[PDB]
Design a protein around this nucleic acid. Structure first.
Lengths: 210, 48, 50, 203
RNA sequence: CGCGACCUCAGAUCAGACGUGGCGACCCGCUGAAUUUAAGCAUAUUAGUCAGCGGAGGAAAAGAAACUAACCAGGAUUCCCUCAGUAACGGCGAGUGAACAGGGAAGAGCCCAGCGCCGAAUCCCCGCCCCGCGGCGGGGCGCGGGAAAUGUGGCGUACGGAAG
RNA sequence: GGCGCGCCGGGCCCGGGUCUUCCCGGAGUCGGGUUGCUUGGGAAUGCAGCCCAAAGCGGGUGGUAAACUCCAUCUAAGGCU
């Protein structure tokens, strides 16, 4: 029975909720497991990074997040082949592999051919046996000095190029900001109506001649 | 039942003087026996 | 198929389009099929002359 | 070479020839028992797609299934309750008259394991299916690395738990927007996520 | 009339291996209410919940897209935060009710049927010794039986594959 | 038990870049009409029966029925993890 002024409101407790209640009393020594069996992981994989195979330069979609950059799933099959690393050799040296990814612009394709040389250079690669190395395998001084990495490998931070303070020319100031947004809206919507009547008016001149 | 014409051509068969003659030319061009493959595979390791 | 190749012989190619639709599928599923039947029909309207 | 033409000719049932063959053969399954073994596979093409090979181990049973629908079981026809639920004569079964084959092969032959099934004839009261199964202890199958996925204790009675390709279809799964009521594992566990209270500690 | 091959089908206390039944707290497949809310009550609500039947495991189920998008594009599955008590339903009444983007935990990816090249190159069982094993596996020797061209094994499957 | 490292004993004859010529895939299923259950999915989100039942520049999807159209994006009717 509502008294007086006071917001109307709909609860969903009409089912038998109590029989399905979830609690997190676990919450503290469920963390302290992950962190343990986390701590197991990389003692198993000694000088390989615990940061694992490296994630590509990838955007966020739609008009909201399309200003941003983030880590992805895997490197496309025209970024691996151009650089000089094969798809089944790339798995065997910390470089990500995904069979689906696309190349639609060359502004996010040149950014992922350079990404793989940075890496290929700064890697340290051990010999098959300790007592007999070969050709591409690195020397026994780096390998002395070489050691594990912590946190994402070459992590992608948020970037923007700066600009100076400029004296404005006499045709920037003579450019409308609102009336050029309204004459691009007008001609996008009405172009379907435009073209059929430039056709039907030019149709009648053809008929009355012949 | 009205057996249709494509499955009906299997009753059409080769006669007696041709069927006992056609298995005498194929008698000279048989595959070798399973016991022949123990003196042919073995016959390479005698000469080499 | 035989029955739709008997409205195509006698040129009622609408009723035939409107007959194939109910059987096989949509208006464009009954288009190429009506274009296929016409072309085998047109085949045996050559191989009789020759 | 020959398996390119065997596929394309079974896809011509409304021809003259296949109309005759799917008729003689179907007369000749109303005559034999409602579950019975079959010496070799009838459509050797279509079988070999769904996994079969010819080797001392595999096997086929050929089961028949009564055709039609479901009628709701109550004494005389008296479902006691509200009016929505008076329904008995136009309701249907959620799984299929395929999978009911895969299962009855399954139950009878309890040593063997189900793998897949396929169509072979129909009448007006009967639908007929062939049904691949595997002896999971024949040394042939125990010792081909590829096959041994079936020998393992989890794949017991696949047919009974919606796992075979005829099985899977009722549980309402695929990828995308058309299947939202499964995200989670399976239908049940979509429902569960949506109906807990998630009571943390501080609140 | 006999003799022999196949095909489809009997019988055995024939030689060797498998299934049944139990527990059921969490998982999978079915089938399936009414009390009760609407201040009456038939659609709605309870609720795909109670009871019924069936199958499992140390977790199950899902799983490398006939996927989301409408972007300067994300890229298997599960899980937490958020998106939201929203967009959508609803005697438009009571009432119910998502996803995608964003950020985390975890992170791993692959095999055939089919087109066709390599003298079935492939597998199962048996008699005999050497070793040897309380997960019957290792080598040699069988004019030893059988499966198989109604198709076995090797290269190989959309990220394309092959020969020269 | 578990990693590392010799001595005998068993296998295995194998790898990438340019040029020419071949060659490519799941059917009573996809798809619809209708009937009943289901869903937040509205001229029908998913499932099933009975009827009709394909295509190969072809087939699904693109949240309001359809005709006439260019684009954008996945390869369905077999399998493991």
């Amino acid at each position: 029975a509502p008294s007086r002024n006071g917001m109307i409101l709909k609860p969903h407790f009409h089912k038998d909720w109590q029989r399905r209640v979830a609690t997190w009393f676990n919450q503290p020594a469920r963390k302290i497991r992950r962190r343990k069996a986390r701590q197991a992981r990389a003692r198993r994989i000694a000088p390989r990074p615990a940061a694992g195979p490296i994630r590509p330069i990838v955007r966020c979609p739609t008009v909201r997040y399309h200003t941003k950059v983030r880590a992805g799933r895997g490197f496309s099959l025209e970024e691996l082949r151009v650089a000089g690393i094969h798809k089944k050799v790339a798995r065997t040296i910390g470089i990500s592999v995904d069979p689906r990814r696309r190349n639609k612009s060359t502004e996010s394709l040149q950014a992922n051919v350079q990404r793989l040389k940075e890496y290929r250079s700064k890697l340290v690669l051990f010999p098959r046996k300790p007592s007999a190395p070969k050709k591409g395998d690195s020397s026994a001084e780096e390998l002395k000095l070489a050691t594990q990495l912590t946190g994402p490998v070459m992590p992608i931070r948020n970037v923007f190029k700066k600009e100076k303070a400029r004296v404005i020319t006499e045709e920037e100031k003579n450019f409308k900001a609102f009336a050029s947004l309204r004459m691009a809206r007008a001609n996008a919507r009405l172009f379907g109506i435009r073209a059929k009547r430039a056709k039907e008016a030019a149709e009648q001149d053809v008929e009355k001649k012949k | 039942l009205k057996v249709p014409p494509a499955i009906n051509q299997f009753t059409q068969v080769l006669d007696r003087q041709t069927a006992t003659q056609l298995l005498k030319l194929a008698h000279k061009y048989r595959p070798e026996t399973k016991q022949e493959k123990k003196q042919r595979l073995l016959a390479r390791a005698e000469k080499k | 198929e035989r029955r739709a190749m008997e409205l195509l012989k006698v040129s009622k190619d609408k009723r035939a389009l409107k007959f194939i639709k109910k059987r096989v599928g949509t208006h464009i599923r009954a288009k190429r099929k009506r274009e296929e039947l016409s072309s085998v029909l047109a085949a045996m309207r050559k191989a009789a002359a020759k | 070479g020959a398996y390119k033409y065997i596929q394309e000719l079974w896809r011509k049932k409304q021809s003259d020839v296949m109309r005759f063959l799917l008729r003689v053969r179907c007369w000749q399954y109303r005559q034999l028992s409602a579950l019975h073994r079959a010496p070799r596979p009838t459509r050797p093409d279509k079988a070999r797609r769904l996994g079969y090979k010819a080797k001392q181990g595999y096997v086929i049973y050929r089961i028949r299934v009564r055709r039609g629908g479901r009628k709701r079981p109550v004494p005389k026809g008296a479902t006691y309750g509200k009016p929505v639920h008076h329904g008995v004569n136009q309701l249907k079964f959620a799984r299929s008259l395929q999978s009911v084959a895969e299962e009855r092969a399954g139950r009878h032959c309890g040593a063997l394991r189900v793998l897949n099934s396929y169509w072979v004839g129909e009448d007006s009261t009967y639908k007929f299916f062939e049904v691949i199964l595997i002896d999971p202890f024949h040394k042939a199958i125990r010792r081909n690395p590829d096959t041994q996925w079936i020998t393992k204790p989890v794949h017991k009675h696949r047919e009974m738990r919606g796992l075979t390709s005829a099985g899977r279809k009722s549980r309402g799964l695929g990828k995308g927007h058309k299947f939202h009521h499964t995200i989670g594992g399976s239908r049940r566990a979509a429902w569960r996520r949506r109906n807990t209270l998630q009571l943390h500690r501080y609140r």
